Short mmCIF file of all heavy atoms in Angstrom, two decimals:
data_model
loop_
_atom_site.label_atom_id
_atom_site.label_comp_id
_atom_site.label_asym_id
_atom_site.label_seq_id
_atom_site.Cartn_x
_atom_site.Cartn_y
_atom_site.Cartn_z
N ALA W 1 32.91 25.56 26.53
CA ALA W 1 33.51 24.25 26.82
C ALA W 1 33.83 23.32 25.62
O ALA W 1 34.70 22.44 25.74
CB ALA W 1 32.66 23.51 27.85
N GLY W 2 33.14 23.47 24.49
CA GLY W 2 33.37 22.56 23.38
C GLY W 2 34.40 23.03 22.38
O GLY W 2 34.74 24.20 22.34
N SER W 3 34.93 22.08 21.59
CA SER W 3 35.89 22.32 20.50
C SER W 3 35.12 22.56 19.20
O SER W 3 34.33 21.70 18.81
CB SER W 3 36.79 21.11 20.28
OG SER W 3 37.58 21.27 19.11
N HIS W 4 35.43 23.67 18.50
CA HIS W 4 34.75 24.04 17.24
C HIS W 4 35.79 24.34 16.20
O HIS W 4 36.98 24.58 16.52
CB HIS W 4 33.85 25.25 17.48
CG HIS W 4 32.71 24.90 18.39
ND1 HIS W 4 32.75 25.14 19.77
CD2 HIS W 4 31.55 24.28 18.08
CE1 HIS W 4 31.59 24.66 20.24
NE2 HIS W 4 30.85 24.14 19.27
N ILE W 5 35.37 24.34 14.93
CA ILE W 5 36.30 24.54 13.83
C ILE W 5 35.73 25.53 12.83
O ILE W 5 34.59 25.41 12.41
CB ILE W 5 36.53 23.19 13.11
CG1 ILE W 5 37.26 22.19 14.03
CG2 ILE W 5 37.33 23.42 11.82
CD1 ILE W 5 37.42 20.78 13.43
N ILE W 6 36.58 26.51 12.43
CA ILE W 6 36.31 27.35 11.28
C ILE W 6 37.22 26.92 10.17
O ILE W 6 38.42 26.73 10.38
CB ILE W 6 36.43 28.85 11.56
CG1 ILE W 6 35.28 29.29 12.49
CG2 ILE W 6 36.40 29.67 10.22
CD1 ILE W 6 35.50 30.72 13.03
N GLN W 7 36.69 26.75 8.99
CA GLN W 7 37.48 26.48 7.78
C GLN W 7 37.23 27.55 6.75
O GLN W 7 36.11 28.04 6.62
CB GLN W 7 37.13 25.13 7.19
CG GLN W 7 37.71 24.03 8.04
CD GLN W 7 36.97 22.76 7.78
OE1 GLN W 7 35.94 22.49 8.43
NE2 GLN W 7 37.41 21.97 6.83
N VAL W 8 38.26 27.93 5.99
CA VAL W 8 38.14 28.92 4.94
C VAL W 8 38.85 28.39 3.73
O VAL W 8 39.94 27.80 3.85
CB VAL W 8 38.82 30.26 5.34
CG1 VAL W 8 38.59 31.34 4.26
CG2 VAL W 8 38.30 30.77 6.67
N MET W 9 38.28 28.59 2.53
CA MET W 9 39.00 28.27 1.30
C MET W 9 38.77 29.38 0.28
O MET W 9 37.61 29.74 0.03
CB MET W 9 38.77 26.86 0.76
CG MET W 9 37.34 26.43 0.56
SD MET W 9 37.38 24.69 -0.01
CE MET W 9 37.88 24.92 -1.68
N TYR W 10 39.87 29.97 -0.26
CA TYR W 10 39.73 31.06 -1.21
C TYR W 10 40.79 30.93 -2.27
O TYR W 10 41.77 30.20 -2.12
CB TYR W 10 39.78 32.45 -0.53
CG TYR W 10 41.12 32.80 0.07
CD1 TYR W 10 42.10 33.44 -0.69
CD2 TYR W 10 41.40 32.53 1.40
CE1 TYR W 10 43.32 33.78 -0.14
CE2 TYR W 10 42.63 32.87 1.96
CZ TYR W 10 43.56 33.54 1.20
OH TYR W 10 44.75 33.91 1.75
N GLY W 11 40.55 31.57 -3.39
CA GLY W 11 41.54 31.54 -4.47
C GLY W 11 40.93 31.80 -5.81
O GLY W 11 39.78 32.21 -5.92
N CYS W 12 41.73 31.60 -6.83
CA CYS W 12 41.36 31.93 -8.20
C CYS W 12 41.64 30.79 -9.16
O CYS W 12 42.56 29.99 -8.94
CB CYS W 12 42.04 33.23 -8.61
SG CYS W 12 43.82 33.30 -8.27
N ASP W 13 40.86 30.74 -10.25
CA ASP W 13 41.02 29.78 -11.35
C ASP W 13 41.31 30.64 -12.55
O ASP W 13 40.64 31.66 -12.75
CB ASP W 13 39.72 28.98 -11.60
CG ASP W 13 39.21 28.15 -10.45
OD1 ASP W 13 40.00 27.90 -9.51
OD2 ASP W 13 37.99 27.79 -10.45
N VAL W 14 42.31 30.22 -13.37
CA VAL W 14 42.65 30.92 -14.61
C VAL W 14 42.65 29.91 -15.75
O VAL W 14 42.82 28.70 -15.55
CB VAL W 14 44.00 31.68 -14.51
CG1 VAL W 14 44.01 32.69 -13.36
CG2 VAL W 14 45.20 30.72 -14.37
N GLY W 15 42.45 30.44 -16.97
CA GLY W 15 42.49 29.60 -18.16
C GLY W 15 43.89 29.56 -18.73
O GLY W 15 44.81 30.15 -18.14
N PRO W 16 44.09 28.95 -19.92
CA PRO W 16 45.44 28.90 -20.53
C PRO W 16 46.12 30.25 -20.75
O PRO W 16 47.35 30.35 -20.66
CB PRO W 16 45.21 28.18 -21.85
CG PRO W 16 43.99 27.34 -21.61
CD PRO W 16 43.12 28.19 -20.73
N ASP W 17 45.33 31.30 -21.01
CA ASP W 17 45.82 32.67 -21.21
C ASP W 17 46.10 33.41 -19.91
O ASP W 17 46.46 34.59 -19.95
CB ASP W 17 44.80 33.45 -22.06
CG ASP W 17 43.34 33.34 -21.63
OD1 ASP W 17 43.08 32.88 -20.48
OD2 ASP W 17 42.45 33.72 -22.43
N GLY W 18 45.89 32.73 -18.77
CA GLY W 18 46.09 33.34 -17.46
C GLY W 18 45.04 34.34 -17.02
O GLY W 18 45.27 35.03 -16.02
N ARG W 19 43.91 34.46 -17.73
CA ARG W 19 42.87 35.41 -17.29
C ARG W 19 41.95 34.74 -16.26
O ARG W 19 41.75 33.54 -16.34
CB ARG W 19 42.04 35.94 -18.47
CG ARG W 19 42.85 36.87 -19.37
CD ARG W 19 42.00 37.43 -20.50
NE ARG W 19 42.75 38.37 -21.34
CZ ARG W 19 43.46 38.01 -22.40
NH1 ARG W 19 43.53 36.74 -22.77
NH2 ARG W 19 44.12 38.93 -23.10
N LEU W 20 41.40 35.53 -15.37
CA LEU W 20 40.51 35.04 -14.33
C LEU W 20 39.32 34.32 -14.93
O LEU W 20 38.60 34.90 -15.77
CB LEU W 20 40.04 36.17 -13.42
CG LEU W 20 39.17 35.77 -12.24
CD1 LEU W 20 39.95 34.94 -11.22
CD2 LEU W 20 38.55 36.99 -11.60
N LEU W 21 39.12 33.07 -14.53
CA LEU W 21 37.95 32.30 -14.93
C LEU W 21 36.90 32.45 -13.83
O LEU W 21 35.73 32.67 -14.11
CB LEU W 21 38.25 30.80 -15.11
CG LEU W 21 39.05 30.37 -16.34
CD1 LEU W 21 39.19 28.86 -16.35
CD2 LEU W 21 38.40 30.83 -17.63
N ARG W 22 37.33 32.36 -12.56
CA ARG W 22 36.42 32.43 -11.44
C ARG W 22 37.21 32.66 -10.18
O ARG W 22 38.30 32.12 -10.03
CB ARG W 22 35.76 31.05 -11.29
CG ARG W 22 34.35 31.19 -10.87
CD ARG W 22 34.14 30.13 -9.90
NE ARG W 22 33.42 30.62 -8.73
CZ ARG W 22 32.23 30.17 -8.37
NH1 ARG W 22 31.62 29.24 -9.10
NH2 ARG W 22 31.66 30.61 -7.27
N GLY W 23 36.61 33.35 -9.21
CA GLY W 23 37.17 33.52 -7.88
C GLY W 23 36.31 32.80 -6.87
O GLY W 23 35.12 32.55 -7.08
N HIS W 24 36.91 32.53 -5.71
CA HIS W 24 36.26 31.83 -4.62
C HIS W 24 36.67 32.42 -3.30
O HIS W 24 37.85 32.78 -3.12
CB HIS W 24 36.78 30.38 -4.61
CG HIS W 24 36.55 29.61 -5.87
ND1 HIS W 24 35.39 28.90 -6.07
CD2 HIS W 24 37.34 29.49 -6.97
CE1 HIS W 24 35.53 28.30 -7.24
NE2 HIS W 24 36.66 28.67 -7.85
N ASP W 25 35.73 32.45 -2.32
CA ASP W 25 36.03 32.84 -0.94
C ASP W 25 34.91 32.34 -0.08
O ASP W 25 33.84 32.91 -0.11
CB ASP W 25 36.26 34.35 -0.78
CG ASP W 25 36.94 34.70 0.54
OD1 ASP W 25 36.32 34.49 1.59
OD2 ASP W 25 38.07 35.24 0.51
N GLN W 26 35.12 31.26 0.63
CA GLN W 26 34.02 30.73 1.42
C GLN W 26 34.49 30.17 2.70
O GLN W 26 35.65 29.77 2.85
CB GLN W 26 33.24 29.73 0.64
CG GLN W 26 34.00 28.55 0.23
CD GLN W 26 33.13 27.77 -0.74
OE1 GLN W 26 31.97 27.44 -0.46
NE2 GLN W 26 33.69 27.36 -1.83
N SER W 27 33.55 30.03 3.64
CA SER W 27 33.90 29.52 4.94
C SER W 27 32.86 28.59 5.47
O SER W 27 31.71 28.62 5.02
CB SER W 27 34.16 30.63 5.94
OG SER W 27 33.05 31.48 6.11
N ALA W 28 33.25 27.81 6.48
CA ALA W 28 32.40 26.82 7.13
C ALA W 28 32.60 26.89 8.62
O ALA W 28 33.70 27.30 9.10
CB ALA W 28 32.77 25.42 6.67
N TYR W 29 31.57 26.47 9.37
CA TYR W 29 31.70 26.39 10.81
C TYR W 29 31.27 24.99 11.16
O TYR W 29 30.20 24.54 10.76
CB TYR W 29 30.83 27.43 11.50
CG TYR W 29 30.95 27.41 13.01
CD1 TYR W 29 32.18 27.54 13.64
CD2 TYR W 29 29.82 27.24 13.82
CE1 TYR W 29 32.29 27.58 15.03
CE2 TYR W 29 29.92 27.24 15.21
CZ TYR W 29 31.15 27.45 15.81
OH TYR W 29 31.23 27.45 17.19
N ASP W 30 32.13 24.28 11.90
CA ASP W 30 31.84 22.89 12.28
C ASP W 30 31.49 22.01 11.07
O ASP W 30 30.65 21.09 11.14
CB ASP W 30 30.80 22.83 13.42
CG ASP W 30 31.40 23.33 14.71
OD1 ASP W 30 32.66 23.26 14.85
OD2 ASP W 30 30.63 23.79 15.56
N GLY W 31 32.18 22.28 9.98
CA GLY W 31 32.07 21.49 8.76
C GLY W 31 30.84 21.73 7.91
O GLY W 31 30.63 20.98 6.95
N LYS W 32 30.06 22.79 8.22
CA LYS W 32 28.86 23.14 7.44
C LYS W 32 29.11 24.50 6.86
O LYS W 32 29.68 25.38 7.51
CB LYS W 32 27.62 23.17 8.33
CG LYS W 32 27.28 21.77 8.82
CD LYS W 32 26.15 21.74 9.84
CE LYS W 32 25.48 20.38 9.87
NZ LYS W 32 24.63 20.16 8.66
N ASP W 33 28.63 24.71 5.64
CA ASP W 33 28.78 26.00 5.00
C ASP W 33 28.30 27.12 5.90
O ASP W 33 27.23 26.99 6.55
CB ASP W 33 27.89 26.06 3.77
CG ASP W 33 28.26 25.21 2.58
OD1 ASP W 33 29.22 24.45 2.66
OD2 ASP W 33 27.63 25.39 1.52
N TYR W 34 29.06 28.22 5.93
CA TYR W 34 28.70 29.39 6.70
C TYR W 34 28.39 30.55 5.72
O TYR W 34 27.25 30.99 5.66
CB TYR W 34 29.83 29.74 7.70
CG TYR W 34 29.49 30.91 8.58
CD1 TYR W 34 28.64 30.77 9.67
CD2 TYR W 34 30.04 32.16 8.34
CE1 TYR W 34 28.31 31.85 10.48
CE2 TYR W 34 29.78 33.24 9.18
CZ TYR W 34 28.90 33.08 10.24
OH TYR W 34 28.58 34.16 11.04
N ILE W 35 29.40 31.10 5.05
CA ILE W 35 29.14 32.19 4.12
C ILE W 35 30.04 32.02 2.92
O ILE W 35 31.14 31.45 3.05
CB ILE W 35 29.30 33.58 4.82
CG1 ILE W 35 28.64 34.68 3.98
CG2 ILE W 35 30.81 33.89 5.10
CD1 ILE W 35 28.61 36.05 4.68
N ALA W 36 29.59 32.43 1.75
CA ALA W 36 30.41 32.34 0.58
C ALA W 36 30.23 33.56 -0.28
O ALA W 36 29.11 34.09 -0.42
CB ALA W 36 30.04 31.12 -0.23
N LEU W 37 31.32 34.03 -0.87
CA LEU W 37 31.26 35.07 -1.87
C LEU W 37 30.71 34.44 -3.17
O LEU W 37 31.14 33.37 -3.63
CB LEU W 37 32.68 35.56 -2.10
CG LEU W 37 32.82 36.75 -3.08
CD1 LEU W 37 32.16 38.02 -2.54
CD2 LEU W 37 34.31 36.99 -3.34
N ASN W 38 29.68 35.09 -3.74
CA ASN W 38 29.09 34.60 -4.98
C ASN W 38 30.04 34.78 -6.17
O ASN W 38 31.03 35.52 -6.07
CB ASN W 38 27.78 35.32 -5.21
CG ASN W 38 26.75 34.92 -4.18
OD1 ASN W 38 26.75 33.79 -3.66
ND2 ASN W 38 25.80 35.81 -3.97
N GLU W 39 29.75 34.03 -7.25
CA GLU W 39 30.59 34.08 -8.44
C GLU W 39 30.76 35.50 -9.01
O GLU W 39 31.81 35.81 -9.58
CB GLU W 39 30.04 33.13 -9.50
CG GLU W 39 30.97 32.96 -10.70
CD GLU W 39 30.57 31.85 -11.65
OE1 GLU W 39 29.44 31.33 -11.52
OE2 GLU W 39 31.39 31.51 -12.53
N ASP W 40 29.77 36.36 -8.79
CA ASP W 40 29.90 37.75 -9.25
C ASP W 40 30.97 38.55 -8.48
O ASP W 40 31.32 39.68 -8.84
CB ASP W 40 28.52 38.46 -9.13
CG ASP W 40 27.91 38.50 -7.70
OD1 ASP W 40 28.63 38.23 -6.72
OD2 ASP W 40 26.70 38.83 -7.57
N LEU W 41 31.50 37.98 -7.36
CA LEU W 41 32.49 38.65 -6.50
C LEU W 41 31.98 39.98 -5.91
O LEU W 41 32.79 40.85 -5.56
CB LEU W 41 33.85 38.86 -7.22
CG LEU W 41 34.39 37.64 -7.93
CD1 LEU W 41 35.76 37.94 -8.55
CD2 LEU W 41 34.51 36.42 -6.98
N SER W 42 30.63 40.12 -5.81
CA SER W 42 29.96 41.35 -5.38
C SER W 42 28.83 41.16 -4.38
O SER W 42 28.26 42.15 -3.89
CB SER W 42 29.43 42.10 -6.60
OG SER W 42 28.43 41.34 -7.27
#
């Protein structure tokens, strides 16, 4: 019966040389963190 929300945000950060600085992939349920890929991407 209730309204719920899943949010996801993912992507990459690069430096001036265009090499990967960091990756991201995380999600939330009802505005609270649910699961996230760690900085090691593993």
